[PDB]
Amino acid sequence: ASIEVKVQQLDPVNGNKDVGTVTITESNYGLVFTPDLQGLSEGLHGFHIHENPSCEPKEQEGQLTAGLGAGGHWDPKGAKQHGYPWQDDAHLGDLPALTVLHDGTATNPVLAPRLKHLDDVRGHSIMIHTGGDNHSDHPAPLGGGGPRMACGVIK
Amino acid sequence: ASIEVKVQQLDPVNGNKDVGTVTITESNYGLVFTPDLQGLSEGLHGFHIHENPSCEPKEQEGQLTAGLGAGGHWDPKGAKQHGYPWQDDAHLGDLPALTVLHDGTATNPVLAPRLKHLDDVRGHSIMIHTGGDNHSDHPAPLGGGGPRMACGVIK
Ligand SMILES: [Cu+2]
Ligand SMILES: [Cu+]
Ligand SMILES: [Cu+]
Ligand SMILES: [Zn+2]
Ligand SMILES: [Zn+2]
């Protein structure tokens, strides 16, 4: 019982490019996201499930902004605030930060305790940001993830 | 409601050195380990609660081995096997791998869903390994963490 999500680096100009996958499985403590990515910059990267099952760009202030088609952080319970994966009054789509090693790969799995069944995340997207995630809207909103760097649609 | 564990880099020959702390707090989904460490090798490192509240070395084949005085992974339920943090039949002391950035620091918190109350971890030790953790006893025992790099006694 799993969902393999194809993830691509976002490039509204020359076209998105494959960088691997993220496999979602169920554990007795929540959904587990196991990455198998490469070609990314080393460090911690914001990692959240977004509203729409789309990784396409959107016009914003005359510019084609990468990944805006995915909408905001998935928040079906209306928490209206960014937080920790283990915080109840935070976007349900807030996952633990992704770790990209010196060699540009990410294979360390992370758990989202608030997510319980695979079908619950189908029909949405998974987003990887250029920046990190301090799990707060302070001092930077949405954890300070910044630009949408990679994305995949959850089938 | 927290426990601030002082962590030291282990070196029996030259002397241990302080590398920071690991703060343990309770969340509605389990214990959260928030590191504030520096001076460590970049990459993912095995992170586990060991049985004894000691970070002392022990002689192992004409070679004083670092942190062996901590004994094995804390396994109060007798799982007798290394696994994932979200796996019920794995050592209870099995925590998510710790991320140390290129700059040698670690501040990314991780959740131990199977650990529910602070008092449970008191009287034991927290260990950070040189190698990572594939959360299995194969192809290497105990996730392949290998040598014990840093350690702290949990009061
Ligand atoms: Cu590096
Ligand atoms: Cu996001
Ligand atoms: Cu260990
Ligand atoms: Zn969020
Ligand atoms: Zn273990």
Copy the structure tokens of residue A52.
């729409």
Q: Which residues pair with B33 in a beta bridge?
A: B24, B110
Gap from CA of B101 to ligand 1 centroid (Å): 7
The binding site of A for Zn(2+) consists of 73, 82, 91, 94
Resolution given for this structure, in angstroms: 1.8
Residues of A in contact with B84 (CB under 8 A): 27, 32, 109
- Residue B81 neighbours by CB distance under 10 Å: 16
Experimental approach = X-ray
Q: Which of B79, B109, B104, B107 is nearest to B93 (CA)?
A: B79
Query: Over A98-140, what HEC string results?
Result: EEECCCCCECCCEEECCCCCHHHHCCEEEEEECCCCCCCCCCC
* CA B132 – CA A89 distance, rounded (Å): 32
Q: What is the largest CA-CA distance in chain B?
A: 47
For tokens 């290129």, name the residue: B102
Taking an 8 Å cut-off on Cβ atoms, the answer to whether A110 and B96 are in contact is yes
Query: Domains in chain A, ordered, with CATH?
Result: 1-155 (2.60.40.200)
Q: Which of A84, A9, A123 is nearest to B30 (CA)?
A: A84
Mutate to test the interface with A, among B102, B108, B136 (most CBs of A within 10 A): B108
Q: Which of A142, A134, A109, A125 is nearest to A29 (CA)?
A: A109
Answer yes or no: is B73 a known binding residue.
Answer: yes
> Which ligand neighbours the alpha carbon of A94 most closely?
4
Residues of B in contact with A114 (CB under 8 A): 29
Is residue B68 within a helix (H) or strand (E), and if so which, with residue range?
A: none
Q: Which of B32, B86, B101 sits opposite A29 (nearest CB)?
A: B86
* CA A122 – CA B111 distance, rounded (Å): 24
Go through A47-68 and write b for each residue having 16 or more CB atoms within 10 A of its CB, e for each that does not: bbbbbbbbbbbeeeeeeeebbb
